[PDB]
From a paper:
The phosphatase domain of DUSP22 consists of five twisted β-sheets and six α-helices, and the structural scaffold is similar to that of DUSP3 (VHR), while DUSP22 does not contain an N-terminal α-helix surrounded by the N-loop.
The S93 mutants were combined with a second mutation, C88S, to produce proteins for growing better crystals, which improved the resolution (<1.6 Å) and helped to determine the structures. In the crystal structure of C88S/S93A, the overall structure was similar to that of C88S, and the side chains of D57 and N128 also formed a hydrogen bond. A water-mediated hydrogen bonding network was formed among the side chains of D57 and N128, as well as the backbone amide of N128. The position of this water molecule was above the original position of S93 and it did not form a hydrogen bond with the P-loop. A93 in the structure was independent of the water-mediated hydrogen bonding network, and the comparison of B-factor between C88S and C88S/S93A showed that the positional disorder increased on the three loops. The S93A mutation probably resulted in the unstable active site structure and decreased the catalytic efficiency. In the crystal structure, the S93A mutant shows that the P-loop is independent from the interaction of the hydrogen bonding network and the B-factor is increase in the three loops, suggesting that the conformation of the D-loop, P-loop, and N-loop cannot be stabilized.
Numbering used by the authors: -1 to 154
Write the structure that this text describes.
């Protein structure tokens, strides 16, 4: 459905879900989630046992997410390098969270944004960033993802 059917594994240690999944103790335990990147209107730390990165942002083409790619990638990558699991969630798990995960996949592979979206959709079929987020991902691919790949190599 339009908000998914529970949080979904995208890659080892990387999940996308909706706001309800992000408070679901059974899902968080089953998936060993210890880091939550919360990107939605009212994002703030809630639960115990979880390291948070909170990005207040709207699901609108007027919302800039590119300025949050670097911090999001650092947060996800350092969690995954330690063998831990990160949930990226928005309200629906469809746009804001998906866009940050696409940027991550693009930085840890050779993929452009469309192949990264295909990867996300294989795990979470409802993924569908708005056209504004799509244009931000396209600019990222043509002008900056190569810088981020080099930063990732130099840092880790």
């Amino acid at each position: 459905g339009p908000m998914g059917n529970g949080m979904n594994k995208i890659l080892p240690g990387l999940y996308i879900g909706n706001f309800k999944d992000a408070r679901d103790a059974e899902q968080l335990s089953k998936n060993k989630v210890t880091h939550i990147l919360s990107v939605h209107d009212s994002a703030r730390p809630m639960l115990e046992g979880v390291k948070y990165l909170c990005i207040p942002a709207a699901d609108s083409p007027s919302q800039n997410l590119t300025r949050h790619f670097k911090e999001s990638i650092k947060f996800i990558h350092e969690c995954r390098l330690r063998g831990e699991s990160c949930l990226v969630h928005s309200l629906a798990g469809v746009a804001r969270s998906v866009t940050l995960v696409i940027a991550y996949i693009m930085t840890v592979t050779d993929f452009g944004w469309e192949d990264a979206l295909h990867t996300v959709r294989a795990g979470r079929s409802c993924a569908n960033p708005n056209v504004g987020f799509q244009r931000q991902l396209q600019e990222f691919e043509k002008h900056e993802v190569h810088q981020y790949r080099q930063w990732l190599k130099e840092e880790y």
